[PDB]
Amino acid sequence: DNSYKMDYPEMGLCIIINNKNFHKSTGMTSRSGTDVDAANLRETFRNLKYEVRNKNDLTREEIVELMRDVSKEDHSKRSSFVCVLLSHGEEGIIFGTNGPVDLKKITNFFRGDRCRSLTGKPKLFIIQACRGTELDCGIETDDDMACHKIPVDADFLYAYSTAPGYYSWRNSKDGSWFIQSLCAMLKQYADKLEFMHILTRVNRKVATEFESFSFDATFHAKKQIPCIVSMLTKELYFYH
Amino acid sequence: DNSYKMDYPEMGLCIIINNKNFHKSTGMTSRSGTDVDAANLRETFRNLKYEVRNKNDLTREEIVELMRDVSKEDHSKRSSFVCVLLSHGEEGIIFGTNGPVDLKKITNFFRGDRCRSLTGKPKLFIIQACRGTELDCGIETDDDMACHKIPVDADFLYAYSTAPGYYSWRNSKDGSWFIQSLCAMLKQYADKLEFMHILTRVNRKVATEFESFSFDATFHAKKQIPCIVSMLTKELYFYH
Ligand SMILES: *CC(=O)[C@H](CC(=O)O)NC(=O)c1ccc(CNS(=O)(=O)c2ccc(O)c(C(=O)O)c2)cc1
């Protein structure tokens, strides 16, 4: 029908890569507050019946190896796959503790031709990381081959914390604006709303309720809009 | 609320930029079939009650001047804004008849801080153009500042014909896979489904029903998935 089959015996894995401390050589600062996000996500996805695996402070090599190994598991009995990345980033890039890795390298292991037991199933990548350094100042308000094949990039969804090219906000006490919002809206709406509609509420929450406050005028009164990228081919409900 | 107000006196403008013939220096071939796309879009959006303006074979300077001018119109009585680009492209780039221009230069005129009469209203950019040269081989199956402000990048939706880095297919006789599918799903579902759900059906239609056939193996048996990029903050229904 019009929605993904989510009544396989297992909902699937939820891999959370939580990079907090970075090698001195990289110059990257410790991501205070990321443990709050990681715990929030773990509970949130546990409640949606995902098999959560938390991984901390992985090098880029370990990230790639982890994703390769996970993609070689047999996911036949699982409805979907979720991977959450919490780290520093730039456009198209997430950081290991020792340096950058392209997101495409991580996601390619899950292409429809490379992970066959996830073919036709939604593969969700949730990314809390910057996509560049820009700050949003805001504004005051007939040959029939039907289904012989599917594209290898079909059935991926990326839930980015921020717009292309932009900074992504996090605070030590409450975690990141995006993950805070995402978890809240999943807690409230996962048993009732289709996923793109949940993510749209997340966009509104981040866009409307958060604004930076800083003694540094260059860092003050800033705003953020998350960015949903869907190559999904069906509606996704976490319930059946 | 949860959905955009779509009962202003006018649905809004639908600008269709149809680039078919290109200057010698571009090395770009004539985009046979694009007029089928242009006409299908004109009729589809007319039926949704948008004020359609078709523009043909614009240089990149004319595109930028056109967008600047349109963004300076008073859109107070309009619910939304639609811009469709039909041309050659690369990632982040659309071609004027005389060469490339960054999409960001076109969309920037419509930011929340730069086009005030569209602040808070959905701005949709529908893009039929390649995003690179890859071909998809497929696989057989405390502080209350709550508004206040919104991000300047809020309330944009991009409906890209294809995934990042990939080719985008066009048929010399029926038009492009994406635009044919988009017009068909709007015709069938605009009176019944929220817009992300209509685009999801477009994704499925393109992914499942189309597969290239070519005497050249390089171009044979290829697939395509469109790519929805939402920075919207509410649900969008074309009926009220
Ligand atoms: C650029 C990047 O990849 C990372 C992404 C990430 O770590 O999630 N972003 C940052 O490194 C980053 C670092 C620091 C801050 C600001 N944090 S703060 O100083 O605690 C702060 C100041 C003012 C203010 O209003 C807030 C707030 O949350 O509202 C936080 C942001 C991003």
Ligand SMILES: *CC(=O)[C@H](CC(=O)O)NC(=O)c1ccc(CNS(=O)(=O)c2ccc(O)c(C(=O)O)c2)cc1
């Ligand atoms: C690269 C780029 O930006 C543009 C985008 C665009 O024009 O919309 N793409 C192309 O330039 C382009 C050119 C030619 C074709 C193939 N067209 S065809 O020769 O009519 C054809 C051959 C085989 C085949 O199977 C089809 C089909 O529709 O199935 C069409 C594609 C893109």
